[PDB]
Amino acid sequence: LFNFAAYLFRLNETRAGKTAYIDDTGSTTYGELEERARRFASALRTLGVHPEERILLVMLDTVALPVAFLGALYAGVVPVVANTLLTPADYVYMLTHSHARAVIASGALVQNVTQALESAGCQLIVSQPLAPLFEELIDAAAPAAKAAATGCDDIAFWLYSKPKGTVHTHANLYWTAELYAKPILGIAENDVVFSAAKLFFAYGLGNGLTFPLSVGATAILMAERPTADAIFARLVEHRPTVFYGVPTLYANMLVSPNLPARADVAIRICTSAGEALPREIGERFTAHFGCEILDGIGSTEMLHIFLSNRAGAVEYGTTGRPVPGYEIELRDEAGHAVPDGEVGDLYIKGPSAAVMYWNNREKSRATFLGEWIRSGDKYCRLPNGCYVYAGRSDDMLKYVSPVEVEMVLVQHDAVLEAAVVGVDHGGLVKTRAFVVLKREFAPSEILAEELKAFVKDRLAPHKYPRDIVFVDDLPKTATGKIQRFKLRE
């Protein structure tokens, strides 16, 4: 009745010859994407992996990953798409928790994944971007004749949110393309899209797979780490019309001596998620490039963006409005309504909500509240209806939004990026700002004092940071999120 891979294959039957993917080694057409995926569905059956059993993907951003993911979906096998920058012990946990029957690993990750497997019938398959080779297994297979007999509400894949196995359906993919990508982003057949966010991050999964494939667009994939220069290369070479980033990437792009000219690129719309986008970055980016960045929030639990700025109605500094098809509510600790201007807990209702966390009743019952998901984010609503992010519940200072303070700090000309956390020095919690300075500025007690004064002049007295620590970089997840817990510890 419904299989997301089979659905895409049918959608794109008329454009078999159009390039679907460009990556570091070449181009792959829609025809080839379907062929190689359906052959991989056969290879899985031949390897003994049944429908509903999980495979673990530890794969770089190459056409192999969408082949593996879509080939698994067509087989009814449940791919679990993993972060590629984790430790062997991290992978041990994912292998054991997922009960993965096979793990497909990029050549560069083979050592970590092999080590993980040795601490334990999971089979290793190796993708080149002695174990069986992914490409060889697919070559040896015939394309599977029919998709598994799945429906809209059948479990299709997991992403990790110990990490929590976040369980998604076939329909959840479809809803993200239908509610967010088409209406908000305006993604179209003739687009060429490029996500700096990797396919293992929910954000990147939609950006570089769900969305372009849903409309017959072309997607650019990149295996290497997303530095400003690596990003610039694909922006210029393949002239994508859509680029998807995160605030730390935009910040560092803007200060690069290598920043491409307006005429060197073709971007018509950009997105940003993960952390909130500072007003000045959006303004300066649009001044230089001519296109807007749409700041949006999504989550692994909601599979993509559910609250976003809209093209032509950008309110830089806010997360915009609910994406139509999604409802959001703010509640206080007691579950009562939140007056505008106050910070409350975000709850989300929409049709892309995950089913559960796998093998975890306590966290599932605390998060998946029937029609509503408890997000873990803190939000405020303005007079004009726009939502403003206060930070994660865990990062709140005590009553103070770390984000409100960070957004003020980065307005100072010396500051490239900032994180604001509460640090307990026995046994008093003090507000501390960690500041990355622009290259033209040197760290000093004078400058630290100037920055404190800068914030004190702009916010209520209980908000300004008590210490400023100058750092070369902030600690960040692979995904570009700031690890404020590290700064606290």
Cβ partners under 8 Å of residue 303, min gap 6: 168, 172, 173, 175, 176, 202, 205, 206, 352, 353, 354
Between the two ends of the chain, the Cα-to-Cα distance in Å is: 50
The three-state (H, E, C) secondary structure of 396-434, written as one string: CECCECHHHHHHHHCCCCCEEEEEEEEEEECCEEEEEEE
How many CB atoms lie under 10 A from the CB of residue 327? 14
Cβ partners under 8 Å of residue 444, min gap 6: none
- Residue in 70, 16, 18 with CA at minimum distance from that of residue 39: 70
**Sequence positions preceding breaks in the chain, C–N over 2.5 Å:** 120, 129, 161, 398
What's the distance, CA 20 to chain centroid? 21
As annotated, the residues of the chain forming the CATH 3.40.50.12780 domain(s) are 1-392
How far apart are the C-alpha atoms of 442 and 445, rounded to whole Å?
Answer: 10
How far apart are the C-alpha atoms of 390 and 345, rounded to whole Å?
Answer: 10
Range 393-489 has CATH code 1.10.110.30: no
The fold of the 1-392 domain, in CATH, is: Rossmann fold (3.40.50)
Dihedral Cα 37, 131, 76, 10, nearest 10 deg: 0
Angle in degrees, CA 84, 58, 486, rounded to 5: 30
Tell me the technique behind this structure: X-ray
How far apart are the C-alpha atoms of 375 and 393, rounded to whole Å?
Answer: 9
Using omega within 30 degrees of 0 as the cis cutoff, is the peptide bond preceding 282 cis?
Answer: no
Say if CB 78 and CB 99 are below 8 A apart.
no
Strand pairing partners for 272? 245, 295
Say if CB 112 and CB 88 are below 8 A apart.
yes
Say if CB 91 and CB 116 are below 8 A apart.
yes
Q: For residue 360, which amino acid is it?
A: N
| Residue 397 token pair | 């200072």
As annotated, the residues of the chain forming the CATH 3.30.300.30 domain(s) are 393-489
What's the distance, CA 422 to chain centroid? 26
Angle in degrees, CA 246, 249, 252, rounded to 5: 150
